[PDB]
């Protein structure tokens, strides 16, 4: 009957303009309204924001538009002793103070097949890319940058497809930056350098050259934005985990505290 919250980003971090505040709980929250009322967010400069639940254990808070660089955010999750419904009580309080770094937006355009990175509006890198093939396309939309990995074993089963099924694989890859919980990554693809900039060959990932993937890993950070445009895919789901900005503000702001 006690629930511990966990807040991200972590205290003291510098994050990109797309990073929502996230509060995760270790038990389903029966009374979302009580949880929301216990969470106090302060911004400087001040900006309006709102809560939206991605699932029964995680609530997110963000503004209507990407954060302004330099904004300082203070989060006080004052859940100690709060009745969160169905006999569960908040076990403790948590907090975080973080800041927003430079505006870094990378756009992957299927019409040009170039991933362009802008920093504070100026083009700093252009990278040829190979996105998802027609049968497994990369969805359009706004993606928040998540974790990064120097090496990972990219395994289709992690994301629902058996490795040993006709469309599964298990492959070692370098310099991977995750942009969706559904398993979309920007990563090094040495075998398809010829196709990059010309033909889509991946299972959904944004495949780029080894040096370009390493650059991305080094210069794109948690909270920065990747926008995908002009593919044959649909749109990334808003409740993906890193797809928050695909929920329009009017829907986000109305929330889902009774759902």
Curated annotation (Swiss-Prot):
Residues covered by the L,D-TPase catalytic domain: 104-229
Function: Generates 3->3 cross-links in peptidoglycan, catalyzing the cleavage of the mDap(3)-D-Ala(4) bond of a tetrapeptide donor stem and the formation of a bond between the carbonyl of mDap(3) of the donor stem and the side chain of mDap(3) of the acceptor stem. Is specific for donor substrates containing a stem tetrapeptide since it cannot use pentapeptide stems. Is essential for virulence in a mouse model of acute infection.
Binds to carbapenem drug (covalent) (site feature) positions: 205
This protein's pathway: Cell wall biogenesis; peptidoglycan biosynthesis
EC supergroup of this enzyme: transferase
GO CC list: extracellular region; peptidoglycan-based cell wall; plasma membrane
Keyword Phosphoprotein found: no
Residues annotated as binding Ca(2+): 83, 86-87
Disruption phenotype: Inactivation of this gene leads to altered colony morphology and growth, attenuation of persistence and increased susceptibility to amoxicillin-clavulanate both in vitro and in the mouse model during the chronic phase of infection. Loss of both ldtMt1 and ldtMt2 results in phenotypes that are unique and/or severe compared to the single mutants lacking only ldtMt1 or ldtMt2.
Organism, scientific name: Mycobacterium tuberculosis (strain CDC 1551 / Oshkosh)
Localization per record: Cell membrane
Key word Signal present: yes
Gene: ldtB
Keywords attached to this entry: Acyltransferase, Calcium, Cell membrane, Cell shape, Cell wall biogenesis/degradation, Lipoprotein, Membrane, Metal-binding, Palmitate, Peptidoglycan synthesis, Signal, Transferase, Virulence
Molecular function, one GO term: acyltransferase activity
Protein name as annotated: L,D-transpeptidase 2
Record text on subunit structure and interactions: Monomer.
Active-site annotation: 187 (proton donor/acceptor), 205 (nucleophile)
Record GO biological process: cell wall organization; peptidoglycan metabolic process; peptidoglycan-based cell wall biogenesis; peptidoglycan-protein cross-linking; regulation of cell shape
Residues of the full protein shown: 150 to 408 of 408
Residues annotated to bind substrate: 169, 182-183, 207
Activity regulation description: Is irreversibly inactivated by the beta-lactams carbapenems via the formation of a covalent adduct resulting from acylation of the catalytic Cys.
């Amino acid at each position: 009957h006690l629930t511990m919250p966990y807040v991200m980003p972590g205290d003291g971090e510098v994050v990109g303009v797309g990073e929502p505040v996230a509060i995760r709980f270790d038990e389903n929250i029966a009374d979302r309204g009580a949880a929301e009322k216990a969470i106090k967010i302060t911004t400087n400069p001040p900006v309006e924001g709102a809560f939206y639940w991605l699932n029964n254990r995680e609530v997110r808070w963000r503004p209507e538009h990407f954060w302004k660089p330099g904004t300082a955010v203070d989060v006080a999750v004052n859940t100690y002793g709060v009745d969160l419904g169905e006999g569960m009580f908040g076990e403790d309080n948590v907090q975080t103070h973080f800041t927003i770094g430079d505006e870094v937006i990378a756009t992957a355009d299927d019409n040009t097949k170039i991933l362009t990175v802008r920093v504070n509006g100026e083009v700093v890198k252009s990278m040829p890319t190979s996105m998802g093939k027609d049968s497994t396309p990369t969805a359009n939309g706004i993606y928040i940058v998540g974790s990064r990995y120097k090496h990972i074993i990219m395994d289709s089963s992690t994301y629902g497809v058996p490795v040993n099924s006709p469309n599964g694989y298990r492959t070692d890859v370098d310099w991977a930056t995750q942009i969706s919980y559904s398993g979309v990554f920007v990563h090094s693809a040495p075998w398809s350098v010829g196709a990059q900039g010309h033909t889509n060959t991946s299972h959904g990932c944004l495949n780029v050259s080894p040096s370009n993937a390493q650059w991305f890993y080094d210069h794109v950070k948690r909270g920065d934005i990747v926008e995908v445009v002009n593919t044959v895919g649909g749109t990334l789901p808003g409740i993906d985990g890193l797809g928050d900005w695909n929920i329009p503000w009017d829907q986000w702001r109305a929330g889902n505290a009774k759902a």
